[PDB]
Design a protein around this ligand. Structure first.
Ligand SMILES: CC(C)(C)COC(=O)CNc1n[nH]c(=O)[nH]c1=S
Length: 253
């Protein structure tokens, strides 16, 4: 799902291709908005497991006390709101790839259970005593510094060294050269389709601004900017006056 042939991304692509044939755990880091799930899916797609499921568990989009239920499943009646027997992400990912996204959101109790599961493949549904097992290839990702999280006692040390086998550091958007405009063009067409518009090009000032702006929010911020432009304007061409703040203002500091 990655777009672009920039020098730093081509190093990423080589690691993805080599790692895909291995079952070794991948640990993706990088600034917010750099494409960790895109990277995780690309590893799966290049792997011999590509025809099996790819499952992403976003530990941030879930309350911390419910990550275990989302990960391992639960039986009906396990806790108060357990109206149904839920199948965990580990079961959805059996014979495939499981992405543990924003993994550092797990509490230390769940990190202990996860350490067990990563070693043995065994787990229990929440509220159940029965042991089960699955075969998943792990891909971990976080926007925190996984090492600082270990130092501040927030992440298990033995868990870190079990997961940090194949690290991948995604480059920030500002360092990806021609990728910025290529991604911007893809977003322009897609958001035009989503909004019923027909933008097809960027004016030269907009291209210069996009290529020199630091994009602290990376591709997420670029998505915001393109959506802002397409929603608020109707034209074939993106003009400089359409670019929202703080793009020009913070670019000059
Ligand atoms: C239309 C499309 C595919 C650009 C929308 O999807 C996303 O923006 C996902 N993020 C990325 N896509 N492509 C990259 O080269 N890098 C990143 S981070």
């Amino acid at each position: 799902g990655f777009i672009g042939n920039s020098l730093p991304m081509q190093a990423v692509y080589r690691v993805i291709e080599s790692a895909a044939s291995s079952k070794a755990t991948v640990f993706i880091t990088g600034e917010s908005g750099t494409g960790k799930e895109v990277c995780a899916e690309a590893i799966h797609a290049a792997s011999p497991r590509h025809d099996k499921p790819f499952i992403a568990l976003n530990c941030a989009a879930i309350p911390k006390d419910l990550i275990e239920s989302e990960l391992f499943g639960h039986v009906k009646g396990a806790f108060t709101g357990a109206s149904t027997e839920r199948q965990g992400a580990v079961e959805m990912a059996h014979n495939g790839t499981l992405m543990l996204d924003e993994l550092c959101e797990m509490d230390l109790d769940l990190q202990s259970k996860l350490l067990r599961f990563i070693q043995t493949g065994t787990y229990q549904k929440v509220g159940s005593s029965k042991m089960s097992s699955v075969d998943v290839r792990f891909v971990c990702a976080t926007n925190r510094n996984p090492w600082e999280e270990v130092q501040e006692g927030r992440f298990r040390e033995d868990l870190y060294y079990r997961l940090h086998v194949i690290p991948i550091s995604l480059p920030p958007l500002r360092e990806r050269g021609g990728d910025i405009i290529e991604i911007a063009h893809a977003l322009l067409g897609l958001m035009s389709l989503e909004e019923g518009k027909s933008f097809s090009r960027f004016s030269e000032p907009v291209l210069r601004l996009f290529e020199s702006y630091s994009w602290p929010g990376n591709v997420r911020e670029l998505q915001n900017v393109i959506r802002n432009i397409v929603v608020l304007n109707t034209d074939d061409e993106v003009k400089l006056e359409m670019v929202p703040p703080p793009i020009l203002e913070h670019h000059h500091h």
